[PDB]
Design a protein around this ligand. Structure first.
Ligand code: HDD
Ligand code: HDD
Ligand SMILES: *[C@@H]1O[C@H](CO[C@@H]2O[C@H](CO)[C@@H](O)[C@H](O)[C@H]2NC(C)=O)[C@@H](O)[C@H](O)[C@H]1NC(C)=O
Ligand SMILES: *[C@@H]1O[C@H](CO)[C@@H](O)[C@H](O)[C@H]1NC(C)=O
Ligand SMILES: *[C@@H]1O[C@H](CO)[C@@H](O)[C@H](O)[C@H]1NC(C)=O
Ligand SMILES: *[C@@H]1O[C@H](CO)[C@@H](O)[C@H](O)[C@H]1NC(C)=O
Ligand SMILES: *[C@@H]1O[C@H](CO)[C@@H](O)[C@H](O)[C@H]1NC(C)=O
Ligand SMILES: *[C@@H]1O[C@H](CO)[C@@H](O)[C@H](O)[C@H]1NC(C)=O
Ligand SMILES: *[C@@H]1O[C@H](CO)[C@@H](O)[C@H](O)[C@H]1NC(C)=O
Ligand SMILES: [Ca+2]
Ligand SMILES: [Ca+2]
Ligand SMILES: [Ca+2]
Ligand SMILES: [Ca+2]
Ligand SMILES: [Ca+2]
Ligand SMILES: [Ca+2]
Ligand SMILES: [Ca+2]
Ligand SMILES: [O]
Ligand SMILES: [O]
Lengths: 688, 688, 229
C-alpha cells in the first residue's frame, strides 16, 4: 500500500478548499441580495458544479458491472526452466495484484446476479512490468475470431430500437446469433449450467481461455492454458433464486466480497498451467488455437505455480476499480502470444478502448494503472501528461542523450521477445480454419459430465430463455443445433417451446466425460462468509439469545449468524421487513419464534382486531422459510421452532432439513454439514 | 417524422460497407495463412473494432436510467394575453415533442422499479426555438440551492469506497443528509409514498417544480407553476412488489411505454399552469422562490393550456433517447426565470454537462437536439462541426456581411428578453433566505392529505430504509426531524428501529389538507395497457380457450389477456416458468387449471413417482396467485378454478376477489371494476 | 502541368517574414481567378517479380524507381477548381487515411506503409475527440453506407436495423457480406503469401543508404548542387 498511499487524500478534520487550495465554503450561491439572482462571478459555485457535471466516464463496452480488490501473489517455485517471467523466478517471491470480477452484458448498475459469463481479470504488478491475465470464470468463449465480437455483443445486448432487455440473453437476437453461429454452444452450456449464476466471486474459478506461450531465457517454449483454481469451492444458484436476489440486492456479490475482506476471510486461488508442447496444437483432436475448446484435465494436468490472495478493498471505488484498465497486451518477458484469432484481435481492442474511457492517451499514468517498476522511454506529451521528462532529445538513435534509453531485447536489458521459433506460412487470407469446424463434440463432453440436476438446470434455463424468443424460425434453428449436441437435450428443451421433437443426428454424439466440470456436485472446501439467518421474535427474548450461542459454535469456520426479528430490539441484526431468503445460505427458526409462521399468515385480513403486524408484509416469516426450502438451502429449527416447519409443510425427514434441542455444538455440526453440501438437489424435478 | 427521417439508415437487402462506403466482408480477420497471426494491414478488422471499442458515452450524471418517446403538443387556445410563447399562440397549434422519463440515482442498467424521484423531461420543438421543461413526477425538490446538488447526490448515490448500494436511499449517507438538511423532508415523503414506485410512466403526473415567469410581448408577467396532468390516472406499487419487479423485469416500465405506443394506446397529459401575480411571492405563507413548497390547488387552480400525446417510439435508442440533451436554458420568448436559487444554478449545469456527454461543444447539432426553426449565428468551429458556415466574417457589428446576422430583441426579430421589470437590490451575499426556513409544515400538509393506507406505506418505507442505517446518531436525528412533521409519523417509524418514542414538538403541527395529493385513493381514468394473466393448463384445452373469450370482453377498454400455461401450446402466451405475478395487473385462474394449485405444491418431493413438473419451479402457479393477492391485485377464478382460491386460502368474500361461471361479460365487468380500483388496500395492516 | 518552380533559401526566409500565408494565398487566388491547377495521375507499372531485380527493394520507401527503368503510364487528370466555403469545417477537419482503399488496389509489405495504416485510423480519435469522424461532411463518402457499426459519441445517423449483427435472420441476412466474387467487396491480392520466422529485424535488402542519394546528386544542374551544399 506504500505505492498507492502517495495519492491518498485524507479529509479527517480539515477545512474545505477549492481544487487549487483556496479555503472556501460551498453551501450558498452568491446572490444579489437575500432573494436575488445568482452571480456569474461565483467561481465557488461553478468549480463545484463543473466537477459534478463531469464526474462520469464511459462505462466499459463489456464487463461494465464489476468489482475489484487488492491482493498479493506468492510463487511456489523457481519456474525458470519453464518461463523467464520475473514474478515466477523464486520460491516465495511475492508480487502485488489487483483483480476485478464482472458480468459481461449488463450496464453499470445492472444486477450482480444476472445470468452471464463472468470476468476474472488479474493484474500482477511485477518488477519487470505489469502483467495482466484478462480471464473469465468459463474456460471457453463464444466465438473463434475477434472480428466477430461486435456481432456477438450486439446480439446479446439490448435491442437497438428500445434498449430491452437489460443484462439478458432471453431475447430473439441472442438466440438468433447462437443458432446461426454454433461455435457459441460450448460457452452457452457453461453459462446456462450453474457457472452463469455463481453464489459469489469467491466461489468460482478463473481461466485465461486462450493458449499462451511460456518462454525461457534461451527461447524454449511450452504452450499453456492458465487456470485460477479457487480454494473456497464452486457454488451456484438456481435461476429463480438469482432473479429474486437481483430484486432484493443488486449488489449481492460485490457486497459478499467487500464484507469477506473486511472480516479477514481472504479468498484465494492457485495459479496453474496445463503445460503442453508446440507439437500438441492439433494432436488432441481439436485445435489449441480454438478458444471454444477446453483441454480436459484427463489429457493434461494442471501444474500449480503459486497462489493469489485477495485481501484489501479499495479506498475509493471510482479511482481504483472503475479506472483500472486491463490489457492482454500488458505482457512481460517470459510469456508470448499464440495465433488464436480471438486473442490476436483482443490485443488491438484493449489498447484502443482505454482512449474512450480515459478520454486521452495517458491512461497508464493513473495510479491504479502505473507499474511498480521504472518507466524510461521516448513517448511524449498527450493530454493529461502527469510526468515531466528531463530528456529533451526523445529519439533513438541519439548521441545527444548518450544513446539512452537503450534498446532491450532477448540478449540485453531483459527485453520482451517473441518466441524466436514462431513462423508464418501460407497465403494471406480471410478464412475460417477447417480445424475449427467441430462446434458440437465438446458441448456434448460438457453435458455428459454433469450431475442429473445440473443437466436439468441447463434444460430449464434454455426452456425459460427460448420461451421468450418470438421467432419460430429462431426457435427451430436453436433446436436443430442443440440436437447435434444431444438428442436428449434438444428434445427436453423443444417440449416447452412448441417445436417438434427432432430426430437424432449421430454425427457428434459420444459418451466421454471430464471430471467435476459443472458448478454442482462437490462439497465446499471452506464455509467462510456464509450466512445463517436465525428467524427469531422480540416477544421471546430467549429466541434472540440463540443467535450469539449459535454464533459461538460457527465462528471457527467463518460462518455468520444474522438475527432477524420484527423490530430492532437488542441483539437483533435485521428486521423481517428488510430480510429475504436470498440473504442467507441457511435459514433456521429459533425456539419460540414459531408463532410467526402460521399457514394463514399470507391471506388473513389485517383488521384492527386481527393482530396482523405492521412491521412486515403479511406472511414474511413463513415466505422466508418456504423460499429457503424451495431454493434448495439448508433449513433448520430449534426446539419448538420445529412447529414452523410443520406450518410450512417441511418435514425434517427431508435431506437438508435439520432440528435440534438447542443452539449448541450438536446442531451447529449439522448446519455445517448442510452448508458444505450448499444446495439440496433432491428438491428439483428431473425429466424422465 | 419527416425531419428525423433524413438521418435514417435503411439496411434491408444491401451489401455491407465500411463507414466510407467501400463494400466489405467482416467475419474473418486477415491472417498469414490458415492458422496464422492477424495482420496490421487489416483495416476492416480495425475500423469495425475501433467503432465497437468507442461505442459508449458517459451516462447522465443523474437520471441515467430512462426511456424516451416522440409525440405532439396541441394548444387549446391563443394564450397571447398570458404569454408571447409561439407554441401557445393559437388554438389547435401543433408542436413536435420528445419526452424522456427516468429515475434519478441509479446508473443506466439499474432497475426501472427502484424507489426514486422520477424525471419527466418534455421538449417542444417550437417554431421559435427548442423549449424544454425539465421536470419530475413530484412537484417539490429536496434542496433549496443548486450549489447543494453534489451534496445531495453524493449522499444518495453509492458509498465512495465500495459503490454500494445501487439505486437506493436505504443507507447511512442518504439518511444522514436528509436529517442534516431537513429541507429534504417534503420530497422525501412524496418519494416514500406511492410516487416513488409508480406502475408506469403513463400513470404519473409531471411538474416543472420551480416558479417561472410567463411574459407577454409588452412585458407583463405572471408567476406560474407548470403541471402535466396525466389522463390515464395515478397508479403505484407497494415496496415488495416494486422489488420483485426489479428482479423479474428490470425493463418493466420502459417495456410498458414501448408496448402501449405500438398498440396505439397513446398516453396523454394536459399542460397546465397555476397562474399567480408578482405580488404573490410571499403572500401565501411560504416563498414562491422556494422549490420545496407546493402551491395547493385550493389556493390557485391549474389553468389548462393544451395537450401532449406520446405516439411514436424511437427507431434507434442510442441515437435518439440516449443522446437527447435537455436544458432549462432552452427557453423561448414569452417565458423567463425566477430567482429560485435551485433553478438559477441548474441553468449553468445543463449547458456544461453536455460537454462531458458529447465530448465536445456541438451537441446541439445531433439530430435529436436540432431545432425545427432557422439557425443563424456567429458561433464557429468546435470538434464535430457538422455545418459549413458560408459567412467568413463571423462577428458583429459588421459591414463585410452587411450587418447580418441581425440582433433580435423585444421589439425586432422576436428576440428573447428578460422580463423588464425584474430588479436586483441588496448586498452581495452567500446566505440562506430566512423565508426558506419552514422545512416541516408542508410535509405535514402532504401527510395529512393521504388515505390511511398510504400513510402506512410511508411509515413502512421509512422503517424498511432506516432499519438499514447503521449509525445510531443518524437514526435518532431522523426521528427528531420526522417528529417536527408529525409525532404520529415519528413514533410509528421509531418503533421499528430501536429509537425511543419522541415527545411531541408541536411548532409546525396543523390539520390542513390538500385534495388527491397521494398516489392512492382514486380510481383509474383509463385501463389501457393493463394486463390480465389467465392461469391455464395445456391438459384442459377449454381453460386455454377462456383467454380469447375474456379478451373479447376486455379489448374495448385496452386491456390484454395473457394466457399462461405449462408449455407453449396453441394459444398460450407465456409459460409458468417465464411468468410472475408482477407481470399482471389482475390474475385469474382458468376453469380446469385448479389442479396445478395444490397447497402441497411448494414442498412436495419431486421424485420419479410424484408427477412434479419439470416445466416450472415447484409451486409456481400457486405462488403467482398468492403473490397477486398479497400485493393487492384483482384476483379471480372461473368455474371450478375457484378451487385454487381455496387451496390458497383466498376467500371470494374479500374485496377484489371475483368468481365467475364463465369468461363472459359479467365476469369481465367485475375484472374491469377491480382494475379500476387497481389496488385493494384492505390487505395491508395499519398501525393503531 | 504548371511546372516545377522553387526558391533559394534567403528568399524563402524573407517570404516567411512578409507573408506567412504566401502559398495558401497563391492557391486560393489562382482558383478564384479561374487558373485551375492540374496534375496527371500516373503509375510506374511493374510485375510482382520485380521486387529485388532493379538492385534495390521495391518495399524500401527510401528508393525511387528511375523513369529510365520504368516509365510513368498516365491514367487521368486532377483539376483543382473550388476553394472551401469554411476552412475549419472543410480543410481543418479533413481526415485522410491510407486505409481508405477501394477494390482494385492493395497494399505491399513496405514496413513504413504497413504501420501508417494503424496510425491514420487512430489519430482521428485525437483530432475529432470520438469515433464518428467519418460522419463529418468532408469525410463522408458519395456512396451508400450499410453496416453493423453502432453508436459512439457524435452519432449523426439513426440506424433503422435494431439487429446489428451477422449472421442474422431477424434482418434477413442483411447487410450482406461482399468479397471478391459477390457484392464488389474489397479483397487482398489472393496470391500474396507470408513465409519465415516472426521477427523484429531490418531487412538486409534495405542496407544501401547512399547510392540513390548519389544518383540524385549526380542528376542536378550545378546551381542546384550548390543549393544543397
Ligand atoms: C475484440 C474484442 C474483444 C474480445 C474478442 C474479447 N474482449 Fe474482453 N474486452 C474488450 C474486448 C474484447 C474490450 C472492449 O477491450 C474491454 C472493455 C473494457 C476493457 O478495458 O476492455 C474488455 C473487457 C474485458 C474484461 C473486463 C476487465 C475489467 O474488469 O476491467 C474481461 C474480464 C474480459 N474482457 C475478458 C475477456 C475474455 C476472457 C475474452 C475471450 C477469451 C474476451 N474478453 C474477448
Ligand atoms: C445544479 C445541479 C442540478 C440541479 C439542482 C438539478 N439538476 Fe437535474 N440534471 C442536472 C443537474 C441538476 C444535470 C447534471 O445537468 C443533468 C444530468 C444529465 C443532464 O443533461 O442534465 C440533469 C438531468 C435531469 C433530468 C434528466 C433529463 C433527461 O431525461 O435527459 C431531469 C428530468 C432533471 N434533471 C430534473 C431536475 C429537477 C426537476 C430538478 C429540481 C427542480 C433538478 N433536475 C435539479
Ligand atoms: C431593440 O433593437 C433596436 C435596435 O434598433 C437600433 O437602435 C439604435 C438606436 O435607435 C439605432 O442606432 C439603430 O439604427 C436602430 N436600428 C437598428 C436596426 O439597429 C433598438 O432600437 C431597440 O431600442 C432595442 N430595444 C428594445 C427594448 O426592443
Ligand atoms: C533447470 O534444469 C536443470 C537441468 O535439469 C537443473 O540443473 C536445474 O535444477 C533446473 N532449475 C531449476 C530452477 O529448477
Ligand atoms: C540485442 O540488442 C543488443 C544491444 O542493443 C544488440 O547489440 C544485439 O545485437 C541484439 N541482439 C538481438 C538478439 O537482436
Ligand atoms: C472418447 O474420446 C476418445 C478420444 O478421441 C475417442 O477416440 C473415443 O471414441 C471416445 N469414447 C467415447 C465413449 O465417446
Ligand atoms: C386579449 O385581451 C384583449 C382585452 O382583454 C381582448 O381584446 C382579447 O379578446 C384578448 N385576446 C385573446 C387572444 O384572447
Ligand atoms: C391552514 O389553512 C387555513 C385555511 O383555512 C389557513 O388559514 C392557515 O394559515 C393554515 N395553517 C397552516 C399552519 O398551514
Ligand atoms: C464470397 O461471399 C459469398 C456470399 O456470401 C460466399 O458465398 C462465397 O463463397 C464467397 N467467396 C469467397 C471468394 O470467399
Ligand atoms: Ca482465420
Ligand atoms: Ca433431514
Ligand atoms: Ca441564497
Ligand atoms: Ca416470492
Ligand atoms: Ca369478492
Ligand atoms: Ca474528449
Ligand atoms: Ca523489418
Ligand atoms: O470482453
Ligand atoms: O437532476
Amino acid at each position: 500500500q506504500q505505492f498507492l498511499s502517495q495519492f491518498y487524500l485524507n479529509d479527517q478534520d480539515v477545512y474545505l478548499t477549492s481544487n487549487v487550495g483556496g479555503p472556501i465554503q460551498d453551501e450558498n450561491s452568491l446572490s444579489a441580495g437575500q432573494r436575488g439572482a445568482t452571480l456569474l462571478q461565483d467561481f465557488i459555485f461553478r468549480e463545484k458544479i463543473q466537477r459534478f457535471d463531469h464526474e462520469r466516464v464511459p462505462e466499459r463496452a463489456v464487463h461494465a458491472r464489476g468489482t475489484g480488490a487488492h491482493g498479493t501473489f506468492t510463487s511456489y517455485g523457481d519456474w525458470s526452466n519453464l518461463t523467464a517471467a520475473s514474478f515466477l523466478s523464486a520460491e516465495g517471491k511475492e508480487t502485488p495484484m489487483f483483480t476485478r470480477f464482472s458480468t459481461v452484458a449488463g450496464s453499470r448498475g445492472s444486477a450482480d446476479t444476472a445470468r452471464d459469463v463472468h470476468g476474472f481479470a488479474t493484474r500482477f504488478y511485477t518488477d519487470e512490468g505489469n502483467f495482466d491475465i484478462v480471464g473469465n470464470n468459463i474456460p471457453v468463449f463464444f466465438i473463434q475470431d475477434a472480428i466477430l465480437f461486435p456481432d456477438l455483443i450486439h446480439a446479446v445486448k439490448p435491442r437497438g430500437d428500445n434498449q430491452i432487455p437489460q443484462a439478458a440473453t432471453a431475447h430473439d437476437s441472442a438466440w438468433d446469433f447462437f443458432s446461426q453461429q454454433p461455435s457459441v454452444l460450448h460457452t452457452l452450456l457453461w453459462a446456462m449450467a450453474g457457472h452463469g449464476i455463481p453464489r459469489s466471486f469467491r466461489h468460482v474459478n478463473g481461466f485465461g481461455v486462450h493458449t499462451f506461450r511460456l518462454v525461457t531465457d534461451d527461447g524454449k517454449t511450452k504452450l499453456v492454458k492458465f487456470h485460477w483454481k479457487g480454494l473456497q469451492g464452486k457454488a451456484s444458484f438456481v435461476w429463480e433464486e438469482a432473479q429474486q436476489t437481483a430484486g432484493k440486492n443488486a449488489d449481492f456479490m460485490r457486497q459478499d466480497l467487500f464484507q469477506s475482506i473486511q472480516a479477514g476471510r481472504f479468498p484465494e486461488w492457485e495459479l496453474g498451467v496445463q503445460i503442453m508442447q508446440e507439437q500438441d496444437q492439433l494432436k488432441f483432436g481439436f485445435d489449441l488455437l480454438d478458444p471454444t475448446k477446453i483441454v480436459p484435465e484427463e489429457l493434461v494436468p494442471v501444474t500449480i505455480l503459486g497462489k493469489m490472495q485477495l485481501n484489501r478493498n479499495p479506498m475509493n471505488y471510482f479511482a481504483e476499480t472503475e479506472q483500472v484498465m486491463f490489457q492482454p497486451g500488458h505482457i512481460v518477458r517470459g510469456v508470448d502470444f499464440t495465433e488464436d484469432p480471438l486473442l490476436q484481435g483482443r490485443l488491438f481492442s484493449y489498447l484502443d478502448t482505454q482512449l474512450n474511457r480515459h478520454g486521452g492517451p495517458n491512461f497508464e499514468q493513473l495510479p491504479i494503472n502505473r507499474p511498480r517498476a521504472p518507466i524510461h522511454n521516448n513517448n511524449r506529451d498527450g493530454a493529461g501528461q502527469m510526468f515531466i521528462p528531463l530528456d529533451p532529445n526523445a529519439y533513438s538513435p541519439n548521441t545527444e542523450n548518450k544513446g539512452s534509453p537503450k534498446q532491450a531485447n532477448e540478449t540485453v536489458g531483459k527485453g520482451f521477445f517473441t518466441a524466436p521459433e514462431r513462423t508464418a506460412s501460407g497465403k494471406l487470407q480471410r478464412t475460417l480454419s477447417t480445424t475449427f469446424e467441430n462446434n458440437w463434440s465438446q458441448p456434448r463432453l460438457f453435458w455428459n459430465s454433469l450431475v442429473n440436476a445440473q443437466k436439468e438446470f441447463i434444460v430449464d434455463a434454455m426452456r425459460f430463455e427460448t420461451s421468450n424468443v418470438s421467432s419460430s424460425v429462431v426457435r427451430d434453428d436453436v433446436i436443430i443445433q442443440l440436437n447435434r449436441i444431444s438428442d436428449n437435450l434438444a428434445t427436453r428443451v423443444a417440449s416447452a417451446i412448441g417445436v417438434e421433437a427432432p430426430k437424432p443426428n449421430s454425427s457428434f454424439y459420444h459418451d466421454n466425460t471430464t471430471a467435476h466440470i459443472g458448478a454442482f456436485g462437490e462439497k465446499l472446501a471452506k464455509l467462510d462468509g456464509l450466512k445463517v439467518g436465525l428467524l427469531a421474535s422480540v416477544n421471546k427474548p430467549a429466541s434472540i439469545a440463540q443467535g450469539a450461542k449459535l454464533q459461538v459454535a460457527l465462528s471457527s469456520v467463518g460462518v455468520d449468524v444474522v438475527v432477524v426479528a420484527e423490530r430492532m430490539a437488542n441483539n437483533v441484526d435485521e428486521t423481517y421487513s428488510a430480510s429475504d431468503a436470498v440473504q442467507f445460505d441457511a435459514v433456521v427458526v429459533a425456539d419460540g419464534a414459531e408463532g410467526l409462521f402460521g399457514a394463514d399468515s399470507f391471506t388473513v385480513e389485517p383488521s384492527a382486531g386481527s393482530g396482523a403486524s405492521t412491521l412486515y408484509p403479511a406472511g414474511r416469516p413463513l415466505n422466508i422459510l418456504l423460499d429457503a426450502f424451495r431454493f434448495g438451502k439448508t433449513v433448520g429449527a430449534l426446539g419448538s421452532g420445529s412447529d414452523a416447519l410443520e406450518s410450512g409443510q417441511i418435514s425434517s425427514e427431508r435431506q437438508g432439513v435439520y432440528t435440534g434441542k438447542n443452539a449448541g455444538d450438536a446442531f451447529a455440526k449439522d448446519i455445517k454439514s448442510g452448508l458444505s453440501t450448499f444446495k439440496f438437489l433432491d428438491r428439483f424435478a428431473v425429466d424422465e
